[PDB]
Structure formats: C-alpha cells, structure tokens
C-alpha cells in the first residue's frame, strides 16, 4: 500500500532530502533493515521545525539542532528522541520535568546547567545505572540512610562540582576509601564515624585540610605525621618545616597544658 | 634525537618532522620486539619497498590509554570531535612509545602538566605549534577562595606504587596518493654475496 | 545501477539523451548539470505530471501544445512565468492569489477572453 503525506512542510522535505542523500521520494525501505541501521549521516542539518517526526518512532539514530528555540516544552509528547548531544549555553530557560519519561535514552550528558531546583531523591529506586554522572550538582541536604542498601559503590566521580559541605557521618558503611582528591574545594565538615574501626587503613589523605588544634582531638595523629615530615610535600615553593604551625597561639610546644 | 631523549618533549611540545628523500628503517623498530603488544597491521614484506610516499601527510591525535579499546562504530564523543574525527580507517600501526618510566625524578613530578583539550584542531595546509591556554571559567578568581572558579590542572597522582595501566597510545594514518609530482628514490637494496 | 519504475516519460527522456549528442554512455549523471535548461524546446511536449516541482525552481516558461491538459495544477503554484500560451477554449475562470508575487511577467497573450465580468482590484498592484 502506498504511503504518502510523509513531509507536510515543503522546506523540511527538501532539508530531509539533502540530509539523507535521497534523490527522489518514490523509494521503498523495510523495517528489519532500518532497525539494523545504527548509523545515520545528516550533515549540515537545517532542522528548523520538528513537525513530521511524530510518525517515525522506530529510529535508532537521530539528529537535532536549534539555535533559536528556547521553549522545548514539546519534549513531553516526544518519545523517540534519545540523541541529545549538543554544547551551547544559549538555552536560558530550563524546562521542568525532563527526567520524568527520559528512560529510553542511550547517551545524554549535560554540563553548565542552570537548574535552580534539583529534585531530591534521584537515586530512590533507579539502581540499574552503571556509569553514574554527578556533574554540576547542587544537593545541599541528603536524606538519612538514603545509601543504606547501596553497598555497590565502586566507580566514583565527584570532581568538577560546586560542593560546599558534607552531612554528619555520610561515609559510615563505606570502609573502602580508595581514590579521592579534595582540592579546589571549600570543605566545612569532616565526616565522623569513619576512623573508629578504620585502624587497619593503608591510605590516608590529609593534604590541604584545616585540622583543628582543639586538644585532645587529633593531637596524636598530628604529632605522628609531624615526626615523619621528611615525606610530606606541598604545592607552593615554601620552607617545608615552617608549614607545620598551629594558628593563633604562637607559644612553644612544651609550654601548652591541655585542659580537661 | 627524539625517540632516545631522556627529557622527552611533552604532549604540548610535540614537533612535526618533514621527511624528504629519507627511507625510514621500519625493519629496525618493527622487529625490535621490545613491545609485546604489536597491534600494527598494514605492512607486508612484498609491498614494503613501494611505501615511498613522496609527501608524507600523517595526522596525529590524542586519546586516553583506557579508552583506546572502547572504540566501536556508531559512537561519538567530544574527545574525537575536539581534536580530529576518526573515520572507519582506524586500522594502522600503533606507534606508541613508553617514556613514562624514563621521566622519574627525586622529589616528585609536579611540573609535567598535560593539556587534554585544545581550542582548535590541526588545520590542513597550515602549521601551528602554539601554546594557547583555554580556561574553563569566565570570571577569574586567581586562586582566591571563592565561587564560580575551578582548577583545570589535575594532580598527576604519581605515587611510587601506583598502577602501570595509564600507558598512552597514538595511531597515525598513511595513505598513498599518485599526484603529478616526480620521484627519485623509493627504497634501497641489500648487496648480495 | 539501473533502477526500474523511475521514469514515467519515455519520449521526453529519449529526446533529452538524443538531441544533446553526448560523447558516450559511460558518463555520470546529476541534477544541477542536467537542469541547466530553463526553457524547454520540445515540439508537442505533453508533460502533465508537474506535481512536486518544488525541487526544480529554475524553469520559468513552459511551452505546452497540449489542448487536453485542462488541469488547474499547472497554475496552482507556478507563479514564476513570464509568458502564457494555453489553448484551453473552455476557460471560464482564473485562479486567484497568484498575483501575490507575479512581478517578472513582461508579455502575455489572452485570446478568446469570454469573461463578461471582471473582478475588483485585479490590476491594482500591476504598477
């Protein structure tokens, strides 16, 4: 049976013809061959309008480009768009409810977002993700025990964010701190309950951290790491022995009487 | 002078060599057997003497060591789209040198700062070895503790007992064209008995 | 590679490939080089199917010695013409809205104009 009326717009028809290198409009295709098509070449895509794609929900590769459309609220009725890979900050308005249906996506990364209200509890039930991105996040408060059953944390990428503080006792069940760096950050609170049973530790990270001199909290560890000062280095070219100086007091070590 | 230099020119100080009337001794490096992983396909003894490219137009790109084997058709990424597009002709000799072990110094290696991202690509019919710097933020804080600034200089993590699996790899493309240009030598011959 | 069920016109394609007297058959084909002709000069050319002509804008004047062709489709969206020659005796109406851009017409022949009534503002924009 003949199928026509595929392209309502005259200019969109010419754009599709040029992009998909189809010479004419009287060609025939099959479903099984198209389903095996995992590459689509549409260079110089002049895709101004999206009307007409609603009737093709069985495409594996897509293409989208719009430099004027800032209201993309039409995405709610759009089920087959998975390829959203563009880099442009011209999009000022961020549509709400993007994540409600977007589960058929294959690859989708996004950076430098202006998301003012990040929904709380993204990791509630969706535990099937393998490679998780925590890019440009703003979660200031976390639910208690939200990561109880999630003892499967192996790949952790936490850099490149605007993280400010951490909750009291977040890494409690996590006894496998292997690789982490804490530079260019503004850490306020160190998690508690992470060094109680961690007496057989083999990796410890203390660089660029404001340890409190409050006796008798970390005096033993500070003295022990000070005794081995011949290994620890710094980033700035300054006299290393003078770096280990507690703030404020200025009195010698032997003259300090720790109260209580 | 290049492949046997201790202080190797870093990724941001690489040099392009123009080869004219010089026959590269592939039989020395290809048969050195110092590198077990010789995934170099494309050379043959019966077609070795005819690989006399009059104008060697070789292109170079950068990829991470752990992502070299993650290349499959129908996949895209910003690393390939920001340096050089990879066609379906990725088959070629993997000219990868191991100079990481020869750049060990006492007191740590904190001066080696690699640049994974470049502003533009190696444009054809033009030479560029510039050292332009691209920043990831608009408003600079210049190290002052504040907001809306990040650090692009990632720590190398050069621990003495760290893993050895961060070996980089690079592959070049060699295609022959027969244009309207003369030639004089294509290869020598070994004197008989 | 030869493809069947593409060309409806046999005589027109034959005369296109014959009148030019090409060098040989082993040459390639395209559309920009083939469509360099904008004024078709083919005696008794009775090409009727002009649907989907939006991909061929360069043609301006079409000659038709086809008294049978009474289809209004020849003037629905063909507004780039500068000459008119239609032997349509039973022409009791003229399509409207085609004057929106018709400014490149120079000379027209309208014989047997049986219009006993004329519309308002028909020539108003033809300054």
UniProtKB/Swiss-Prot annotation, chain B:
Changing residue 32 to L: In strain: Omicron/BA.1. Changing residue 147 to P: In strain: Omicron/XBB.1.5, Omicron/EG.5.1. Changing residue 113 to Q: In strain: Omicron/BA.2.12.1. Changing residue 4 to Q: Reduced viral infectivity. Changing residue 113 to R: Increased resistance to neutralizing antibodies. Decreases HLA binding to NF9 epitope. Increased binding affinity to human ACE2. Residues 109-117 are annotated as: Immunodominant HLA epitope recognized by the CD8+. Changing residue 7 to K: In strain: Mu/B.1.621. Changing residue 107 to S: In strain: Omicron/BA.1, Omicron/BA.2.75, Omicron/XBB.1.5, Omicron/EG.5.1. Glycans are attached at residue 4. This is Spike protein S1. The gene is S. The chain holds residues 340 to 532 of 1273 of the full protein.
